Amino acid sequence: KILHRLLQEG
Amino acid sequence: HKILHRLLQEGS
Amino acid sequence: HKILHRLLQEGS
Amino acid sequence: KILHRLLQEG
Amino acid sequence: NDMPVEQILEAELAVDPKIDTYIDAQKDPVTNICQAADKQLFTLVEWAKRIPHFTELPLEDQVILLRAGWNELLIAGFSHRSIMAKDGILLATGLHVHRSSAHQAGVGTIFDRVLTELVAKMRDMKMDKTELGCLRAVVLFNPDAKGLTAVQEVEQLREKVYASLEEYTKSRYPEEPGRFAKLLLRLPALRSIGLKCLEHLFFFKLIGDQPIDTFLMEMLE
Amino acid sequence: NDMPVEQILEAELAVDPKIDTYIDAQKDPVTNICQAADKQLFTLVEWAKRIPHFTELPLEDQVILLRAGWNELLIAGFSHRSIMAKDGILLATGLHVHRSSAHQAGVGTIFDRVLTELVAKMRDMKMDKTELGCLRAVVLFNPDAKGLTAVQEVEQLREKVYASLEEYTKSRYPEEPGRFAKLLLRLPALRSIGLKCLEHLFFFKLIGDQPIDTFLMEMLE
Amino acid sequence: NNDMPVEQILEAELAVDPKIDTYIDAQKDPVTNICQAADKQLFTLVEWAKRIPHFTELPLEDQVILLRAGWNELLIAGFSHRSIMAKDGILLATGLHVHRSSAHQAGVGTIFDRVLTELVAKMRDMKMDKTELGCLRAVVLFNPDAKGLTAVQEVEQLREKVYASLEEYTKSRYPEEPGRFAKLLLRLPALRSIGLKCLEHLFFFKLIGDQPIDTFLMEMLENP
Amino acid sequence: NNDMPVEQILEAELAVDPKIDTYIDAQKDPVTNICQAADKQLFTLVEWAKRIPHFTELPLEDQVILLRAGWNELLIAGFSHRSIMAKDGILLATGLHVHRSSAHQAGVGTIFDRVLTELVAKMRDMKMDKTELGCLRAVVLFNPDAKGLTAVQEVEQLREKVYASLEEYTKSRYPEEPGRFAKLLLRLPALRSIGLKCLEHLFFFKLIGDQPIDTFLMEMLENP
Ligand SMILES: CC1=C(/C=C/C(C)=C\C=C\C(C)=C\C(=O)O)C(C)(C)CCC1
Ligand SMILES: CC1=C(/C=C/C(C)=C\C=C\C(C)=C\C(=O)O)C(C)(C)CCC1
Ligand SMILES: CC1=C(/C=C/C(C)=C\C=C\C(C)=C\C(=O)O)C(C)(C)CCC1
Ligand SMILES: CC1=C(/C=C/C(C)=C\C=C\C(C)=C\C(=O)O)C(C)(C)CCC1
Secondary structure, eight states, X not given: XXXXXXXXXX | OHHHHXXXXXXX | OXXXXXXXXXXX | OOHHXXXXXX | OOSXXXXXXXXXXXXXXXXXXXXXEOSOHHHHHHHHHHHHHHXXXXXXXXSTTGGGSOHHHHHHHHHHHHHHHHHHHXXXXXXXXXXXXXXXXXXXXXXXXXXXXXXXXXXXXXXXXXIHHHHHTTOOHHHHHHHHXXXXXXXXXXXXXXXXXXXXXXXXXXXXXXXXHHHHOTTOTTHHHHHHTTHHHHHXXXXXXXXXXXXXXXXXXXXXXXXXXXXXX | OOSOHHHHHHHHHHHSOOOOOOEEEOSXXXXXXXXXXXXXXXXXXXXXXXXXXXXXSOHHHHHXXXXXXXXXXXXXXXXXXXXXXXSEXXXXXXXXXXXXXXXXXXXXXXXHHHIIIIIHHHHHTTOOHHHHHHHHHHHXXXXXXXXXXXXXXXXXXXXHHHHHHHHHHHHHOTTOTTHHHHXXXXXXXXXXXXXXXXXXXXXXXXXXXXXXXXXHXXXXX | OXXXXXXXXXXXXXXXXXXXXXXXXXXXXXXXXXXXXXHHHHHHHHHHHHTSTTGGGSOHHHHHHHHHHHXXXXXXXXXXXXXXXSSSEXXXXXXXXXXXXXXXXXXXXXXXXXXXXXXXXXXXXXXXXXXXXXXXXXXXXXXXXXXXXXXXXXXXXXXXXXXXXXXXXXXXXXXXXXXXXXXXXXXXXXXXXXXXXXXHHHHHHHHHSOSOOOHHHHHHHHOO | OOSOOHHHXXXXXXXXXXXXXXXXXXXXXXXXXXXXXXXXXXXXXXXXHHTSTTGGGSOHHHHHHHHHHHHHHHHHHHHHHHGGGSSSEEEOTTSEEEEHHHHHHTTOHHHHHHHIIIIIHHHHHTTOOHHHHHHHHHHHHSOTTSTTOSOHHHHHHHHHHHHHHHHHHHHHHOTTOXXXXXXXXXXHHHHHHHHHXXXXXXXXXXXXXXXOOOHHHHHHHHOO
């Protein structure tokens, strides 16, 4: 989604 | 069903 | 608001 | 879930 | 032949509402849509009376078909009309109901289904009045409807309708081999949205059975 | 002190419904729940009149508080009562409304929220009548409510209530340092479910504004 | 013609055909019988889907969406068709036969009769074969109206391909009957209606909390 | 006491504090201003969450559920608190100041005043600090009532830990005020009320189709 994106590259 | 019956008789 | 006012006067 | 499970080992 | 698409086109044309502009409502959309429906029910009968052979079915069957079909018949009708709106539906009373009113009034979710699964697809393929009239006729000729006497008669009438539709379609749109399928494949969505509307309507009818008691009314003002 | 938990307990006890068995209804659950509400509104006032200091607020504020608080006050009440049911709520009219009726009647989703976020948690921690009365008092003393005159007065009353609650809690449940928090942290859910109910109620009130026209009624029977 | 060969859809139906030649009539509580058969068939249903051309190239979140939106009509279509071999009853994948009298006694008679008269009898009278059944199911599977699809176009398009292959198969295998393709597609609205009404019965048996229901079925009734 | 050190929550608030010392009052259309600031803050909001102890040990499908359920109250709490520094206005992370007169002219005055009187003024009057703000936000984040959580217990439990640390910090940093902990938690119901009403305004601006809205914000309004 974008949220998933953001939460994985962490 | 009064309304539908009545309407089905009239046209023709 | 008639019902709430009236009820708020009565008890005491 | 179970459905995911089932759909991946394919 | 015997089930001519031209007379089916006639039947649709004869029931377009005579229609000005279309003002909004945002005020009681649900009410407005139910009034439009009641209003269109009268004209639904006249439409049916004009579909070939319909009135030569037994009287009893003519009423079963219309009691079984109306909601899907009315949904198909306003959906096809509403193609020229963006995100709204156009009622026969000349009112336009916006998607934003529909969510505000609590029916957002079934409304969206009408826009996405009916209106938008009717629009993307430019379904014409002839295809719509045929689809409605197929729905009107529902040989599954309970209690029918002339079962086999309705079956033959529906078979007629779709043969003429396929015919009309192959010839008016020969660039589109899938068109006929694509049209029939909208009927499941119609069926489905039809059922969800009736739930809505049964719920409003029981609500309206019984006013709110007077103190509760007072807290709501 | 000055805001004693004992009198708060008294106020709750004085308004338990005098209660037999609890028969189902499955028939018009929404109606039944709205009648129970109307009924409890009368007793809600008496409850309030018995919360210390409430009646020494200006009359005007007493009405603002109760117009602002009732729905959350009534939801908290039936939720706490309903702890002994499994998946249902117990109305003050002695009716039990099953989760399965609530979905059938179209309010399944807010109903489930009541069970999960209120009833089940009230049950898991065994919230007692004293904690419930305090929580309701805190809600009754809402210093954010619009148009209040004695703002600061309500603020002081709510501050009292929660100090006595914390006190009651630390002493009746000293095995549970988190208990007081856990109780206050149910108020957001209450707030939220309260708002969703009022939407429901406004929608039924407009439905009921206007019957269904007569042909439409006839298609629904 | 295209990229959606009916042999492969037929290969799909046949790989999941529970091969059953003797049934036991089951007068006990049919609802539990039907639930267990449905749980059981959910597992085959996924195997079935994975064997449908291009299904498994779809965004995974889309495979899940389709199966979760289509399971109830898909399984209804399955046992309605196996059931053409019974008379007034349905035939479960678990080897049980449930008679209509027994559905009536258990208070689900009406929806039961709707399956007999709208699906089974029609499928039997037009001698719907396994190829057409698979296509119909594949059409139902590739449902581009399902909420939350990310690849809507790919789904639409795979739909179109199934119904192009169906139609061509039909024209070739049954040229006596030029209406056959339409007759097939026109069973889908009943399929949709009856699928909604069964899901309503199920969801309600689940909410009453009494009626058993196993675990894949349960995951489905939580997924809708 | 436990496993949820407030230093680390405070470290979290400070890492996302947009450091801003001069604002421009924005009388133009405030709604677009607020939307863009919200889009902008959604990105920091995720950075913020990832820095909350144990957040990133949660089932991933749970991180998503929490952020998607908590974003609107989380961001409201953020700018309400930065805004204690204004008077009758709010201060956006984008450097704009929106005055209440201007919210009124744009027809969102009522919810605007609710933020001033129920959140900003209270936060200012009790001198809520950044530590308490972070805890409140962490409490809101670890919302065990969110639909679809798989690790409910882990969430509950992390909630409990935040509010245990909060309470102990409060007792120690503000022993003058024994009610402070309660005063903090009692701002959450208003936070919840005002969050619902803003989401209603947003969803409605989205459905009207006119009002701009960027892309992370849009993904949120499609996620609810
Ligand atoms: C879709 C819909 C509803 C029902 C509409 C039906 C069943 C008939 C409307 C026909 C019209 C509006 C006729 C016309 O103007 O041609 C209800 C009321 C449940 C509310 C939400 C949206
Ligand atoms: C929760 C709920 C609803 C509203 C209930 C409210 C706001 C008051 C009920 C109080 C009772 C039932 C009093 C008592 O018996 O103590 C409505 C009607 C929207 C329908 C769905 C479930
Ligand atoms: C039809 C029917 C029901 C639902 C069945 C469904 C949703 C699928 C059945 C799966 C089978 C029977 C699989 C197979 O046998 O291949 C319920 C429970 C409402 C009881 C009434 C009759
Ligand atoms: C409050 C408010 C609205 C919603 C704001 C929301 C949901 C979050 C704002 C984020 C900001 C402003 C982030 C930051 O500045 O840190 C709407 C759009 C209803 C307009 C009325 C006032």
